[PDB]
């Protein structure tokens, strides 16, 4: 109905509890492997944040896999930073990690992140 | 790190995509039964929004159930309104549904909703 009321902090409170479930390894259903480093996560959160994961988990065969291996060129620290951003809205962008974070966000199809990385790089030139 | 930047709309964008997955019945993993009416949902979203569902899906036996039956006193329309709120932050509170919505939120242990219902009732007295 058009007469709904809205709770401002609801979406942020849901994301905080989804990250608490990840921290405690509760109902995680996939392992993402990046150059032998392993990251446990929830498929629904990955799909909600990334064009690449949305395409992977809507495929009739890949939706049932419990392990997904990323391209060997992907940096594990860059992936870790982006997985933390998916679950918290906070991005740990630093001079020493920005090139890896940008390349990983291009691969994962996370366009807001790619745009912000490009702007921070352009400001230093 | 304490030098993170934050994307304001990220949590709301994640919740919008979780509701799109629910609409299309993608990776839903539980059916909630309320007086023979059936509602498909994601266990992680239910746990993130409700004290009752958090307790149910952290139990070592109930975590593996694919169907959960609610108490026969629970109203299906009240449950439907609260499930929509979990996935959108919007609550369709009307004079004709407020008593059922409040009783359902007390059972589900959704305290912000219980408080708002009490205030709207107190204003009409």
């Amino acid at each position: 109905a058009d007469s709904c009321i809205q709770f401002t902090r609801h979406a942020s409170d849901v994301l905080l509890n989804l990250n608490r479930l990840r921290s405690r390894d509760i109902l995680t259903d996939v392992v993402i492997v990046v150059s032998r480093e392993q990251f446990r996560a929830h498929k629904t959160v990955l799909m909600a944040c990334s064009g690449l994961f949305y395409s992977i988990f809507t495929d009739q065969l890949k939706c049932n896999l419990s392990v997904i291996n990323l391209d060997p060129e992907i940096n594990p620290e860059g992936f870790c930073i982006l997985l933390d951003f998916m679950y918290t809205s906070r991005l740990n962008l630093r001079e020493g990690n920005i090139m890896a974070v940008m390349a990983t966000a291009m691969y994962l199809q996370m366009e807001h992140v790619v745009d912000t990385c490009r702007k921070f790089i352009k400001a230093s030139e | 790190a304490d030098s993170c930047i934050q994307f304001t709309r990220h949590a709301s964008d994640v919740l919008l995509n979780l509701n799109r997955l629910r609409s299309r019945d993608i990776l839903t993993d539980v059916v909630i039964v309320v007086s023979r009416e059936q509602f498909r949902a994601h266990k992680t979203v239910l746990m993130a929004c409700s004290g009752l569902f958090y307790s149910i899906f952290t139990d070592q036996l109930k975590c593996n159930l694919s169907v959960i039956n609610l108490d026969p006193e629970i109203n299906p329309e009240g449950f439907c309104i609260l499930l929509d709120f979990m996935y959108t932050s919007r609550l369709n509170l009307r004079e004709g549904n407020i008593m059922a919505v409040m009783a359902t939120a007390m059972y589900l242990q959704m305290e912000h909703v219980v408080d708002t219902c009490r205030k709207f009732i107190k204003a009409s007295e």
């Binding site: 709904c4 009321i5 809205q6 709770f7 401002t8 902090r9 | 919007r90 912000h112 708002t116």
Partner: peptide, 5 residues
């Protein structure tokens, strides 16, 4: 919290 969206 609550607002008119």
């Amino acid at each position: 919290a609550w607002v008119i969206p």
